[PDB]
Design a binder for this molecule. Sequence first.
Ligand SMILES: [Zn+2]
Lengths: 132, 304, 115, 98, 57, 69, 192, 19
Amino acid sequence: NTLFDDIFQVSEVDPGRYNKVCRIEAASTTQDQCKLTLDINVELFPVAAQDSLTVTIASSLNLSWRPPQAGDRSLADDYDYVMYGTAYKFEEVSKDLIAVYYSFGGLLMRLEGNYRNLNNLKQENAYLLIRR
Amino acid sequence: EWNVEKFKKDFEVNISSLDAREANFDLINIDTSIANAFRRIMISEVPSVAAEYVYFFNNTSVIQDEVLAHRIGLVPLKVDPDMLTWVDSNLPDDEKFTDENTIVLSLNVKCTRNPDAPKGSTDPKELYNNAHVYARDLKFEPQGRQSTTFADCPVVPADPDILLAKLRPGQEISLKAHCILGIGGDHAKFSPVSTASYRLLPQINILQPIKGESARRFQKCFPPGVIGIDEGSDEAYVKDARKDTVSREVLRYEEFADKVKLGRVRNHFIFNVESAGAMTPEEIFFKSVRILKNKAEYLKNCPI
Amino acid sequence: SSRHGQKGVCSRKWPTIDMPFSETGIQPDIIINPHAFPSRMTIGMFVESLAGKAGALHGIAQDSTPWIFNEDDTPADYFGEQLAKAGYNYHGNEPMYSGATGEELRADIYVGVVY
Amino acid sequence: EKIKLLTQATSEDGTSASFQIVEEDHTLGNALRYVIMKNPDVEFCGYSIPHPSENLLNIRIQTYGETTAVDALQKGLKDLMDLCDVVESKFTEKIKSM
Amino acid sequence: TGQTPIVKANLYDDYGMDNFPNGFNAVVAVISYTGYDMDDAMIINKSADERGFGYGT
Amino acid sequence: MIVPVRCFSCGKVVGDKWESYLNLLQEDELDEGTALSRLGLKRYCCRRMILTHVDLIEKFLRYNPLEKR
Amino acid sequence: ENARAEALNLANTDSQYLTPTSGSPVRGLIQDHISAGVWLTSKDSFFTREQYQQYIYGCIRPEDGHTTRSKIVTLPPTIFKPYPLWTGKQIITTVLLNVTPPDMPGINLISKNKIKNEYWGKGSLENEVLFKDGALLCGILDKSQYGASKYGIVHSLHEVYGPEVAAKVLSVLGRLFTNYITATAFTCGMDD
Amino acid sequence: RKDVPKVEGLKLEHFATGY
Ligand SMILES: [Zn+2]
């Protein structure tokens, strides 16, 4: 089941010295103090500045791994881009703020926001799903 | 899902050209894992005939025996390999050869000074007789039954103008060469192709319009016919992509920094096969495919 | 060895099919590790391979007496213009493919002829 | 003889085995590996060359549990043979057309 | 079998070095592909070796 | 010493082209590149094998033990 | 047999990982493997299912005993949609997971490497290596991790799993970075 | 100083396979 959901307004897409991956700085359109940094490979999910993304962190996809076979359903069908990683840090920026660091096979996400609506993310293997 | 039929529907072949020595064709919608298998089998697995055993009786030229036998082995022979069988290396060297698996070549030649050479002449062919030993000098000695099997077509070198040796008067060369079957994996002389290889079809994605005189220089950064100028509007477009040798002169200018991306089509192989002379490139490709198939079949039939 | 003190023992005789092949069908007869250069710093071997490829193409020979090129008339620019005017790459690189698997290698390989 | 099953890697369920083929190299290994991976039933396929100076090829097949690795290899071999047959037939068609 | 260098000094001809060739022109790839040539080793094409590349007595 | 039978890199038989290259160089005033192109050598791997051949065998041959000098 | 057992146990090469001179390690991959590692463990490296499984099997080969599980085990892909895409740090993680014995956790290392953050872009953290239960989550594998560097990954694998496991790790990492350097070769030229 | 003289008569000596 889900653990987080929000709508983000991408501020910058920064390529760096890479080809496929890019750095996304996205601010939440629902919370005054929730922002995001994420690394996705824009060869698969190309993103431009001043866009809108539906970011969802889920504990699972069911409604080990194995390629899909005819007659399979999963949560990912609602989203275009889904990465799988894990959390490795939980930093408190200040009082009533918290940052949670995810690493999707080396692809790094630093999700920050108020503790009130981030209080469902813990050090487990969590999926990340993105939608336009 | 991938199936035999799902591959057979999309796979297609375009034979761009075909001589008796070079055949340039295409394999589309196939994987590199199989295109490279074909290339490797062509280069180093298709059997052919080359001289292996050399029996010098007398040699006095500047060329030493090892170098001479090496050159004689390197000479391609216009023999269809199907006409003869393989050799058992376990058998004794007396009976290791027969008339159905060994082709015998001889080279008996003696140089002598020509008495009719004009004064002041320096041409070696005028001064001396048999001053040059050519591959055409390799006579064929049909033995046993092969006298009538090879009667339909005599054995000759693929290139009879190969310069095997040079002689000066007094010097002679006398030898017999035994030619057997072999594959390029053992020795590079048995490989039937001068070079067999493929190249991914270039792909030129023009990201942005290039109207104006910028198209003239854009096309100028490519082989002559790769890019065309549109007749209606002054736009640039890709006429033929096979014509492009990937030189990346476009990226050398700051103008087209964000106007084009050069890539490739990973399922589109422009095969190019050139034969040594013993077989034809279409038969080389056919032999390679049959070899891969029979190898897989041998593995199937292999008990486990 | 080359003519630039780049000695090294022949490690293995690589099979031709296993050797990387280029888009023009040629397989190098010598493979030299790129890591030989950063410490030895024999840039002469680079510029010689460039000029040797250009000369083998055009059917010419290029003099390599020292001090004909200066800080303006760079040998890289000279032999690169010569390489481009024959269809090849200005930097001497060649798209090559791996002969072991079959796929194209990540970057353009630097090839040429050296003595 | 030619093909060999490494008893140190075969399992009781047979779904995961390793095969040692002599006189083979990348040429057969890579094509066979691709074709066997085209089977959705297998979970792991790869080819290993123990040493470039010896004519030995290692193939690993682990299945998901409906077919044995040996029959996965048999299916891969048959599929490679059929692939070669269709390539040859299309080449002969384009030769006749020309 | 020696060869003259494609790229050579002018004084190569003046001292008549072509009467005594020292090396062969070869196609050399500056590539990390083999893994058998890291410190100083180098890889020689087997086919070229079977064709007389760098042969001597 | 003498023209190699095959090109080292690819294997294209270049052993039957040395005399023709010499003739195209001497009789016609062809450049080496033009002569090699007209000889059928396209890859520079094949071009170098005839462009750079020295032919020391002719010098070797002037020392004949079996002929009075 | 006495000298046999001496050379196998006392003078063997597995025991000579650190020089007694100062305790610094003395074994590691050298140059080609180092650059291959920097390429394999960058964020730009993605591999399909066939590429991932082929790399892992080619460097492990459970018929010789590199694996401690009698059956090769892999990881879920980093990217699920549009199509599966494992990364290079997952190659490193799977190699470690197959060599490191079961019934034991993974290394929790926090080290650095020679290549700074400014050389990867903006806001990058690729200079900070990070392991967590045997999985590489950050940073490139450098000379600081295999080579003559203290407190890198092979040194820590030594300190935690004995000398034989670090022997297997260096051997398997050499095989991995070799089979990968033939697939995507490394070069240098006048443009550099 | 006179720059190294550019060779003349330089044309495309390399073409893609089958051309
Ligand atoms: Zn050649």
